Subunit: 268 residues, 2 copies
């Protein structure tokens, strides 16, 4: 049986048989020496059936080679099974994210706020945890901290890139009684003089949105991130962070400012 | 911000930014014309945020290069959603098949049979449906009936490959007096003669199991397929076929006879 007849018996392409002969998965029963013509046999079909049976389970080709040439490989079927359930979990996550994306696109004609899930590494910060009378007043006590720390900690170099964020320890929304905590990432440890203390913040997987524009429409992004959290079955594991990437310090226009809100979450 | 600092901001590889600038998505703000250095801005951070948000949803990159500038394209999200739904339903199918595979290596010391789905196209066959008392007389009675057909039908030529098979139109287990229907695919219509008629047998999806060995143990393959159909959440749609690939016509030793059982099946 030539390769054209075998490809019609097997209902597979000829190039598939060429590839399987090249890699050594399915070798023809007899190859004509002068022409090169591959000839196949029923005993090759009995093996192509096994190849197809394994390949329909999503096994990679090299896994199929290992399974059919070397027996007692029950660890490879377990690896493929665990990977299949992991991919199923990831696929359910992706499905929820794309359903949410369509309900939002069908909600507002322009999408102002995309949501991205990113992992934040561990870091060394100096932090001051304090009760703030108003969000407008929160901005006032930060530049005092910025000069005082550089005067009190000489040669202290902030990391690059600059991770300067806020920990919202409030489990509910309020305007005037915010128990907030100002953090700023630094390269190495230091002295803990004053109300400013040093600490490490654990690496977290967090869903983040970057808000461009003034600080009054941030409630939109928070409700959106909360909406994302309720829609996609995540649970808030830690306090939300507020990372100030660009602001009045690089650019004078207040509507081009940008900050990224991070929601530490786990899928539950 | 040079490509290294920006790549540290986004926690992404420099090769990713190089590739992106190559394909046109996320071109940097300023390309130094002297040395080719790529400099980035926070506006590229905002473009990359949504790039990564779509990439985390499964969209291919060439889908992203249309999705992020032709913002009104909305069919590509329900399209990606239906595509992911098809992939998840297949992954869940594969998961049931691998757990079943594992159960079978627990049940039997050897994976003697290996099931595999295949699509059997529609075909014009000559068919004779009747009741037979046993297997020995049925096996003996087939070849004279074939000589009768191939002689009495001038111009009738067999199909390449040679698909000769049987259907079992019973509903309960009959070891004897089995309402069997023999068919053999022909390239074109011949005229009916007596109890043998011609018809076109519809294209089906079927699970298949090859049995290399004597004929008195093909019932085991059916048992395996029945367990496979009941376990893996499948349903027998039509009468189970049995295709004769190799037999008394090509080889004289019974221990190397290879026959393939086909169960027309659909998933629940
Ligand atoms: C969902 C979240 C708890 C979890 C609640 C509890 C504390 C709330 C923030 C603070 O009020 C400060 C600030 C007020 C602005 O008005 C809107 C933005 C800010 C960041 C609020 C957003 C959001 O509503 C927070 C994080
Ligand atoms: C499990 C299955 C039920 C399906 C519903 C039972 C019911 C009818 C049974 C077949 C017939 O008996 C004919 C034939 C007899 C041979 O001896 C063994 C093969 C055949 C094809 C049998 C296989 C199997 O045993 C069948 C499909
Ligand atoms: C210590 C030192 C600098 C800043 Sb800032 C800032 C950030 C958020 C809200 C208000 C101010 C800063 C600068 C670069 C990168 C990230 C943050 C700052 C610097 C100069 C002038 C005004 C403000 C804060 C603490
Ligand atoms: C018409 C009907 C049946 C057979 Sb065959 C057979 C031949 C070639 C390829 C496939 C099948 C047969 C039997 C004895 C001698 C010569 C040919 C046949 C036998 C048993 C069961 C099914 C088919 C041949 C023509």
């Amino acid at each position: 049986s030539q390769i054209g007849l075998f490809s019609k018996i097997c209902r597979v392409t000829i190039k598939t048989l060429h590839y399987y002969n090249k890699i050594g998965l399915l070798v023809p029963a007899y190859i004509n020496p002068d022409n090169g013509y591959r000839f196949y046999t029923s005993d090759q079909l009995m093996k192509f059936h096994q190849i197809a049976s394994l390949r329909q389970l999503g096994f990679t080709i090299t896994e199929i080679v290992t399974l059919t040439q070397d027996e007692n490989s029950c660890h490879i079927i377990e690896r493929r099974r665990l990977e299949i359930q992991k991919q199923i979990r990831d696929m359910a996550d992706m499905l929820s994210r794309i359903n949410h994306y369509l309900q939002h696109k069908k909600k507002e004609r322009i999408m102002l706020y995309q949501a991205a899930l990113k992992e934040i590494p561990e870091c060394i910060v100096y932090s001051k945890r304090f009760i703030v009378p108003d969000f407008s007043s929160y901005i006032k006590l930060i530049p005092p901290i910025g000069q005082e720390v550089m005067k009190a900690n000489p040669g202290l170099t902030l990391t690059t890139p600059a991770y300067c964020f806020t920990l919202y320890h409030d489990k509910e929304y309020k305007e005037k009684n915010m128990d907030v905590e100002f953090c700023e990432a630094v390269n190495d440890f230091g002295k803990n003089e004053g109300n400013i203390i040093f600490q490490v913040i654990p690496a977290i997987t967090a869903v983040t949105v970057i808000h461009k524009g003034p600080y009054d429409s941030l409630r939109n992004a928070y409700i959106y991130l909360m909406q994302w959290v309720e829609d996609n079955g995540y649970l808030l594991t830690n306090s939300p962070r507020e990372s100030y990437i660009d602001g009045i310090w690089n650019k004078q226009d207040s509507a081009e400012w940008m900050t990224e809100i991070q929601f530490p979450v786990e899928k539950v």
